[PDB]
Design an enzyme around this catalytic site. Sequence first.
Site, PDB file in Angstrom:
ATOM      1  NE  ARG A 289      30.830  27.308  49.147  1.00 25.56           N
ATOM      2  CZ  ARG A 289      29.672  27.107  48.512  1.00 25.56           C
ATOM      3  NH1 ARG A 289      28.693  26.596  49.176  1.00 25.56           N
ATOM      4  NH2 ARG A 289      29.493  27.372  47.210  1.00 25.56           N
TER       5      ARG A 289
ATOM      6  CG  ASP B 199      27.810  30.443  41.791  1.00 23.81           C
ATOM      7  OD1 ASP B 199      27.820  29.899  40.683  1.00 23.81           O
ATOM      8  OD2 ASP B 199      27.432  29.870  42.816  1.00 23.81           O
TER       9      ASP B 199
ATOM     10  CE  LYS C 137      24.265  23.337  41.849  1.00 19.94           C
ATOM     11  NZ  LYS C 137      23.922  24.776  41.706  1.00 19.94           N
TER      12      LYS C 137
ATOM     13  CG  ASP D  38      21.685  25.791  38.892  1.00 16.52           C
ATOM     14  OD1 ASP D  38      20.508  26.140  38.908  1.00 16.52           O
ATOM     15  OD2 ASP D  38      22.463  26.146  39.749  1.00 16.52           O
TER      16      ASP D  38
ATOM     17  CG  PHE E 189      35.937  18.805  42.326  1.00 22.47           C
ATOM     18  CD1 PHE E 189      36.583  19.659  41.452  1.00 22.47           C
ATOM     19  CD2 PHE E 189      35.149  17.847  41.805  1.00 22.47           C
ATOM     20  CE1 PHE E 189      36.346  19.584  40.093  1.00 22.47           C
ATOM     21  CE2 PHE E 189      34.924  17.759  40.451  1.00 22.47           C
ATOM     22  CZ  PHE E 189      35.512  18.629  39.588  1.00 22.47           C
TER      23      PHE E 189
ATOM     24  CG  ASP F 230      29.558  24.714  42.211  1.00 24.01           C
ATOM     25  OD1 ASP F 230      30.045  24.325  41.101  1.00 24.01           O
ATOM     26  OD2 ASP F 230      28.621  24.120  42.830  1.00 24.01           O
TER      27      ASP F 230
ATOM     28  CG  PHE G  94      18.912  18.495  52.103  1.00 29.89           C
ATOM     29  CD1 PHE G  94      19.112  18.701  53.455  1.00 29.89           C
ATOM     30  CD2 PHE G  94      19.829  19.015  51.202  1.00 29.89           C
ATOM     31  CE1 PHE G  94      20.212  19.421  53.913  1.00 29.89           C
ATOM     32  CE2 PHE G  94      20.923  19.737  51.650  1.00 29.89           C
ATOM     33  CZ  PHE G  94      21.118  19.931  53.010  1.00 29.89           C
TER      34      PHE G  94
ATOM     35  CG  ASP H  86      19.241  24.859  51.481  1.00 28.39           C
ATOM     36  OD1 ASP H  86      19.720  25.062  52.588  1.00 28.39           O
ATOM     37  OD2 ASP H  86      19.665  25.416  50.443  1.00 28.39           O
ATOM     38  CG  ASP H  87      15.389  25.976  47.344  1.00 30.44           C
ATOM     39  OD1 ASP H  87      16.618  25.966  47.536  1.00 30.44           O
ATOM     40  OD2 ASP H  87      14.905  25.572  46.255  1.00 30.44           O
TER      41      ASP H  87
ATOM     42  N   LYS I 140      30.222  20.741  58.064  1.00 32.95           N
ATOM     43  CA  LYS I 140      29.724  19.868  59.112  1.00 32.95           C
ATOM     44  C   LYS I 140      30.143  18.422  58.889  1.00 32.95           C
TER      45      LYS I 140
HETATM   46 MG   LIG Z   1      26.833  28.213  44.324  1.00 35.87          MG
HETATM   47 MG   LIG Z   2      20.244  27.344  50.016  1.00 30.35          MG
HETATM   48 MG   LIG Z   3      25.888  27.125  41.892  1.00 31.50          MG
END
Ligand SMILES: [Mg+2]
Ligand SMILES: [Mg+2]
Ligand SMILES: [Mg+2]
Lengths: 339, 339
Positions: free
Chosen positions: B102, B97, B190, B164, B88, B93, B229, B233-234, B47
């Site tokens: 994405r 993971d 993070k 994390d 980047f 990431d 934020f 988001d969670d 976005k």
């Molecule tokens: Mg990730």
């Molecule tokens: Mg999330």
């Molecule tokens: Mg991650």
Amino acid sequence: AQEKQDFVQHFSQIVRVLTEDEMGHPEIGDAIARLKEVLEYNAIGGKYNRGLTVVVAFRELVEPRKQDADSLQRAWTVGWCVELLQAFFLVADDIMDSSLTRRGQICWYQKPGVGLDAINDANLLEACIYRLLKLYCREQPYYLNLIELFLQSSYQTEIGQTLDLLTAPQGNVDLVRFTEKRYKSIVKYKTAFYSFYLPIAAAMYMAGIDGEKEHANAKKILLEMGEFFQIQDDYLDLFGDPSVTGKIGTDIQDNKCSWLVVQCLQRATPEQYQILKENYGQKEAEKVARVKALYEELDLPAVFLQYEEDSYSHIMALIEQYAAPLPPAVFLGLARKIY
Amino acid sequence: AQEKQDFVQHFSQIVRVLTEDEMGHPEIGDAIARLKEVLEYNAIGGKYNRGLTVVVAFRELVEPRKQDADSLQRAWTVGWCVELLQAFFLVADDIMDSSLTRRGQICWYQKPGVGLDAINDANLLEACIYRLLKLYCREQPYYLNLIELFLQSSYQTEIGQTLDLLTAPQGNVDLVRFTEKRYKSIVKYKTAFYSFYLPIAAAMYMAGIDGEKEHANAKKILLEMGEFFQIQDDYLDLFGDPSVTGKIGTDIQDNKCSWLVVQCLQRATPEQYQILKENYGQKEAEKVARVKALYEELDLPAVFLQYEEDSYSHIMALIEQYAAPLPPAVFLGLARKIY
Ligand SMILES: [Mg+2]
Ligand SMILES: [Mg+2]
Ligand SMILES: [Mg+2]
Ligand SMILES: [Mg+2]
Ligand SMILES: [Mg+2]
Ligand SMILES: [Mg+2]
């Protein structure tokens, strides 16, 4: 040398400053503990040739009246920054090549519980450089010069590494990609710039030597010495004595754009080109024996010895012509150790 | 908004400058072709909220007499630098993971023929930031300020990413690590610092606003807005409507230190703790249904709505108190879009 002593010792303060100095932020302890382990495992264990070069050159270049303990300490820190640039590249490169060991030690990413997390550890080693510069050099007039130097060295090493990955893609055997211009191009960007330019150029800026001509001139000598270093390294991978080199070579098995194979492709008849299409990149030892054999048929080591003599004269001529106003000893020290 | 238009359009010149501008170095064409593909695939498709924030804030902060085409162009370039910082992080990431997609697109490292080479592409995207800054801003007085800002944002994002990785190691299920202090600590380093501080702070330096108090003050507001934020988001990952969010959530299956599970662990009786030891991180849908169910038993969404109201008042109070001398609109624009 008279300096190696102090260089390794100072790593302990590099680590103190990078870990103690966020001690008034407890919530990040556990990550700072990990950064200590990344630093310790990856920054230590090499010969430190590049770090020490910064220090040696600083000593040869800065007027002795301006070499107090604080100055020296800054030069030791910038040396270590070059080492950390290194560690960053190597940890990342080993992941990408699926390497097992480095410096005959287990690659960091292969350590139980590390794996791909090493991508972030590698990034951190890079970040640490700029932290140390800020901590040790922010008030100096060469600060921003150094920052830009380190970022440009990274960009160049990365662009070099791209060329390398595009040229020798593992599983896409295509000796067609292995030309001499390509070869020289990979070495320059991937190896010579950070290994031979970065350290002398860093010492230069520390000395106040910041003109573009001075740096263009040092660069001419140093990229040329980098190209020889790497060609010698390719030669020795196969024909070196492992006891002397500390290295048992595997360029042929790993499908490298080695200088040897560029040379070979320039000198092969079509039968030989196919013998090399047949054995280049097999683990099996007799296939490797077969390629070496082909290299000897075409007198590649005689070619190398000839190249080594020509390039020695050439570097000395480059030094006579482009060193000034730097002391030629800055270059010749390095020529003596690589040749 | 009135600006999104110009922001995406300018990406084409960002790409021109980063690829055309080593056109007088042909030996690296093939790597520069690849950098174009990395840029195009990874920097485009979001976005652009963070990039645009730089531009909006620049417009609200710089006196209109000092907003000529060159200035604006620099603000569009710095916006894109934030986007590239982003790209980047994300490319790296996703490799770590083992992500599949994405932005509902195939992750760059999963594209045939990319694989772990993406580690180097990710590094390059980072390098590009500093190239653009040099090209567009080296003569400006905020140049070095911006460089330091971008390096500190990276370091902080990386230290955050370490926390994390240490907290939620995939396969070492240990809900014991998921405390609230830990949670808030991960979000801060993070996510919040580069997502909410970096862009406003960048616009500030461009505006000449470089004092430590001004930046300490903006940071207080912005880290607090970043924490909201991410908690939002969670929450939305699980209870959001996928059609509205554009997201189908998988935090529970992926073993996240989500705010929901921190909250849950503070409110679980021992039977519930074990129900959560039983279902947290299974792909199987009924196990996921089971955790959600547990979250609803303990009224976590009512907890969230309560948190959302409190934090809204808190941010507004922070704005009234710490905005000055910036226009409050700089913060409230962002509060309005996140809340
Ligand atoms: Mg990730
Ligand atoms: Mg999330
Ligand atoms: Mg991650
Ligand atoms: Mg390698
Ligand atoms: Mg390699
Ligand atoms: Mg070698």
